[PDB]
Every structure is written in C-alpha cells, then in structure tokens.
Design a protein around this ligand. Structure first.
Ligand SMILES: CCc1cn2c3c(cc(C(=O)N[C@@H](Cc4ccccc4)[C@H](O)CNCc4cccc(C(F)(F)F)c4)cc13)N(C)S(=O)(=O)CC2
Length: 374
C-alpha cells in the first residue's frame, strides 16, 4: 500500500498525495528532507492546478502569524494555521498539524510540476519563524503510534518512488544497510570523510567536504559542493572524460550536452565515491555515484533526435547538499529514533552492463582528524 506512493518529474522533486482540511482537500506535496515547514499553495497562482481553500475547512484554525521561507531556489510567504491532515497512501491516520498557507511566492512553484505544496521532514531547529513551530513528522509521531522513522526510495520525464512511513520495507533494497550518524538534529546533517573520482582521492583536508555542513536533502536536485571541492571534482571529471571536450557552460550547469539518441558515452565519465562517517571510530562506508545519476536527462521533444543532459553537480556557499541525484537508486532510511541515516542499494538501482551504484564497507582511516567543520 505504501510502495510507489511517490511521483515526480525529473529535476522537479518527488511528491506524495496528501489531504488537508475537513472535508478533505487533496493536494500533491513535495517530499523535502531539507526543510521543516509544511506549506501549501492557498491562493491562485499561474502554475497551481489547485490550492488549499481555508474557508471550506471547518477544522482550520488561524494562528494569526505570518511566515516567510527563502530556500536556495525560490521563496514564499504565508499565514500560519493548523488543520487536519492525512496521507491516503501512507499510514491510515489523521493528524492535526501546522500548515503555512502560501499567499505569495517567487520562483517556488514550477510550471507544469504537479505539486502544490511542500512537506519539510527535517527538525524543528530550522522551522520558520522559529523552533516552536512543530514540524509535521513530529506531530505525526506524537499523535499516532507511528515509529519515529521514515525511508525514501527515489527512482530515476516522469519518475516515481516510495516513502515508507514508520518503517523499512525490505523489498525496496538489496544487500546491507549502512548507517551514518546524524551529527546534529536540524537538517539531516552528516559527515563526509573522503571523496574519490575514478578511484582517485581528491586529497583535501576532510573538513573541506563539510564546510560548513553536509546534508541529505530530497528537496534539492543536484549534488551541491563547497567551491573548493566543486572545483577539484570538476577538474578530475574533466580529466577522466578528456577524450571529449565540452563547453565551460556545461560544467557550470548553464548548457546541455547532447548526443545522438542511444549513444551517450557513459564509459568516459567517472564514478564518484562519497565516503560517509561510520557508527564506529575511524570507520566509514562509501556510496558510489554513476554518471547516469549526475548527468540528469532533460526531456524535450524538440531535442529528441538526441539524448540531452544537464550536469547535476554544482557549487554551494552553504555546504554539501546530497540531493535527489545522489539519493536516487539508494534506499535511504531516516532513522530519527536512533539519530542515524541508513543507505542501501535500492530495487531501482542505477547500473549498466559494466558498473553499478554501490553501498560498501567498512573502510578504515589512520588519520584521527574530526571531519566536522564545527
Ligand atoms: C526541485 C527544484 C530544484 C531544481 N534545482 C534546485 C536547487 C535547490 C532547491 C532547494 O532550494 N530546495 C528546497 C525545497 C524546494 C525549493 C523550491 C522548489 C522545490 C523544492 C530545499 O528545502 C533546500 N534545502 C536546504 C535549505 C536551504 C535554504 C533554506 C532552507 C530552510 F530550512 F527551508 F529554510 C533549507 C530546489 C531545486 N538547486 C539550486 S540545484 O543546485 O539543485 C539545481 C536546480
């Protein structure tokens, strides 16, 4: 019943069906582990197929307080209230939850996207206007018997996946689940201890990988890297792929790269390995990212004599973001109860006949350094 409860469009997030209000109003809601506010369109907008109509809900309560949330991409403002909320293809429960009713927005809603709101699944510490605004998942756990854990299987124009609330579905992964500690409960903050491209260590002090934090963020498309790390990674991927020369704009995500249909030279692009801090001192495991993940297909019938891609690795001034292109093809367990994130190869894993995405360990390092930036 919870399997295949996510849909989406490539590059535009993954969403789950929800209802708000009494009687229930059905909305599609983007699943975002990178923020902590539940917010829904609540006024007409050119890109909204539908919106929350507070006047039609008998259970709506105005909190008489406005709220503004600026993401990396897009921003919105709205009015806080509470109302009853369900998830038709999740646990059969009804929870009263905080809801920001979006009345104004800028570059938030996406033309043709199919979602009308966002579900911030991270912790209260980053909720706006402040941490007293209890996030949705906290309310769900407090009000029901749902275990304090959820798991995401994001699959690679239309895409799909599963959000399993309150548990782990073993049919969605193979091999072992490897856990990395949640360093601080605000974002889902983790620690990267090593980065390799084409098996070659980037050779930086490991704190650079976590400047100034590293997070797991289903609401962000790309792998985003601190400038120093980004520049080193791009240099190494360029070197690996030097049999072909792409315009500088491709590497900056400003331009597509296109090949005749069916002829994408996957083999010239390297595998990227991200080593995550283990649960035991100086131990780690790695997740390996194939080019089928970090070259994001851009669907466009106009260009359809070709396969065209955007480089889905980009620069960040706010730390590492392991976004959707990293999560796709892994089964990712947000084990809040035990303050850890689990990774396993998912049933929808990425692979060709030569290489496959992997989650593998353990690895040991002799270096005693804490890789946390703070
Ligand atoms: C999913 C649309 C999309 C496409 N991109 C990008 C993008 C960043 C976001 C992003 O900011 N995602 C938000 C949620 C979201 C926003 C707009 C549309 C859909 C989803 C995440 O919440 C960001 N998580 C970290 C963060 C940053 C600032 C403030 C907050 C907080 F906590 F909400 F205040 C969280 C979405 C997106 N990048 C700039 S990018 O490098 O991945 C390339 C393109």
């Amino acid at each position: 019943e919870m399997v295949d409860n996510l849909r989406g469009k490539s590059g535009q997030g993954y969403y789950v069906e929800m209802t708000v209000g009494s009687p229930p109003q059905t909305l599609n809601i983007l699943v975002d582990t990178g923020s902590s506010n539940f917010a829904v369109g609540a006024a007409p907008h050119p890109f909204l197929h539908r919106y929350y109509q507070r006047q039609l809900s008998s259970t709506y309560r105005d909190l008489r307080k406005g709220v503004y949330v600026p993401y990396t991409q897009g921003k919105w403002e709205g009015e806080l209230g509470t109302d009853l909320v369900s998830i038709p293809h999740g646990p059969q429960v009804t929870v009263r939850a905080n809801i920001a009713a979006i009345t104004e927005s800028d570059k938030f809603f996406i033309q043709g996207s199919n979602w009308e709101g966002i579900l911030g699944l991270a912790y209260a510490e980053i909720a706006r206007p402040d941490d007293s605004l209890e996030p949705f998942f906290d309310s769900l756990v407090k009000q029901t018997h749902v275990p304090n854990l959820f798991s995401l299987q994001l699959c690679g124009a239309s895409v799909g996946g599963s959000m399993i609330i309150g548990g782990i579905d073993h049919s969605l992964y193979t091999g072992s689940l490897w856990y990395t500690p949640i360093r601080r409960e605000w974002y889902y903050e983790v620690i990267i201890v090593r980065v390799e491209i084409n098996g070659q260590d980037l050779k930086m002090d490991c704190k650079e990988y976590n400047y100034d934090k590293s997070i797991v963020d289903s609401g962000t498309t790309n792998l985003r890297l601190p400038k120093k790390v980004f520049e080193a990674a791009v240099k190494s991927i360029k070197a690996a792929s030097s049999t072909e020369k792409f315009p500088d704009g491709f590497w900056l995500g400003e331009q597509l790269v296109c090949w005749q249909a069916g002829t994408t030279p996957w083999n010239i692009f390297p595998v990227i390995s991200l080593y995550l801090m283990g649960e035991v001192t100086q131990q780690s495991f790695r997740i390996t990212i194939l080019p089928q993940q970090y070259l994001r297909p851009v669907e466009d019938v106009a260009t359809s004599q070709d396969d065209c891609y955007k480089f889905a690795i980009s620069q960040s001034s706010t730390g590492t973001v392991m976004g959707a292109v990293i999560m796709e093809g892994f089964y990712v367990v947000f084990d809040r109860a035990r303050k850890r994130i689990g990774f396993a190869v998912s049933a929808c894993h990425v692979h060709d006949e030569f290489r496959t995405a992997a989650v593998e360990g353990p690895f040991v390092t002799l270096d005693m350094e804490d890789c946390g930036y703070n």
